[PDB]
Amino acid sequence: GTVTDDYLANNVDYASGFKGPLPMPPSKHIAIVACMDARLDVYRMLGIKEGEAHVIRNAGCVVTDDVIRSLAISQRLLGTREIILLHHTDCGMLTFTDDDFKRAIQDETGIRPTWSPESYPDAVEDVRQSLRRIEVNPFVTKHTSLRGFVFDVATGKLNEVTP
Amino acid sequence: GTVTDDYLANNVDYASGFKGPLPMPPSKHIAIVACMDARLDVYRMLGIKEGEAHVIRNAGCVVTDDVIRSLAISQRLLGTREIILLHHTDCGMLTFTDDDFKRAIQDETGIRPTWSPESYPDAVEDVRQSLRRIEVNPFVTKHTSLRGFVFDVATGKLNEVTP
Numbered sequence A, B: 001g002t003v004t005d006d007y008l009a010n011n012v013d014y015a016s017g018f019k020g021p022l023p024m025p026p027s028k029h030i031a032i033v034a035c036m037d038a039r040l041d042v043y044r045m046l047g048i049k050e051g052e053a054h055v056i057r058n059a060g061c062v063v064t065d066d067v068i069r070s071l072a073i074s075q076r077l078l079g080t081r082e083i084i085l086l087h088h089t090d091c092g093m094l095t096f097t098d099d100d101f102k103r104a105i106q107d108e109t110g111i112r113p114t115w116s117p118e119s120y121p122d123a124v125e126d127v128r129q130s131l132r133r134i135e136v137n138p139f140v141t142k143h144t145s146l147r148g149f150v151f152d153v154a155t156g157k158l159n160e161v162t163p
């Protein structure tokens, strides 16, 4: 028995009380960019219901090109117009540097990844940096609201960052 | 006000009942790669609790280099050893093609994106292609289980896909 097996069993119960289908476009025309961190239940954190919001998550809530791609699709094809960025306290990206992470992988595998690990030293600062990445990008321009926050993993509160 | 405003007010209530902080490493040592699709509440779909699992989401649940990066970090730094891949029915990626998407963006903005939109015609087949991407990648090699599923947006049920 794996965790996957357990989660599939959970899904049978989820399915038993499921109502659907809902429409594809987010009913609230909003996209959340968040971290993959195990301590972030994005839906409960923001009181989101099914069908309302796109949720995009990766290591460190980094505005990579994959995030730009997902946001471009979200706005242009599926009509979203708000963006929430969520970093958080005690994030894994503050605990290593890119050069160290790459060197370690190179030692084990013989090669260095071409991608940047995208670590950063300070979360508040990187929210500003991430907001700027979105502002400067010519493909994510349909939003009427772009706001960035740091989630406190000890209190559950969101604290806004000024760009 | 905006939806962001409403969602922030929702967080006040969330924060009132919060219990933390929890440890950084996923307590169930698992990573989920899923779609940003608004109809997918991944936590509830799999009966996930706070602190258990990394959840990564983009447009179309595509295994891009950002997903590879996030899995590499998840495994190497934070000890996850299982992967669940999660496509779904009525996916937005089935509704367009890459070339036409980029053509539209270029007509409107004067610029063509560097990134591939990464659309695909067949969700089940792309699960297989996604599993294959992970299996051949030299930077994500630690998992003891890698499984892919198609979430039915009409029933809430997961259907496993086999290579």
Ligand SMILES: [Cl-]
Pocket (backbone or CB within 6 Å): A042, A043, A055, B042, B043, B055
């Ligand atoms: Cl989520």
Ligand SMILES: [Mg+2]
Pocket (backbone or CB within 6 Å): A134, A135, A136, A137, A138, A139, A140, A141
């Ligand atoms: Mg912009």
Ligand SMILES: [Mg+2]
Pocket (backbone or CB within 6 Å): B134, B135, B136, B137, B138, B139, B140, B141
């Ligand atoms: Mg591999």
Ligand SMILES: [Zn+2]
Pocket (backbone or CB within 6 Å): A035, A036, A037, A059, A060, A061, A088, A090, A091, A092, A093
């Ligand atoms: Zn994090």
Ligand SMILES: [Zn+2]
Pocket (backbone or CB within 6 Å): B035, B036, B037, B059, B060, B061, B088, B090, B091, B092, B093
């Ligand atoms: Zn989708």
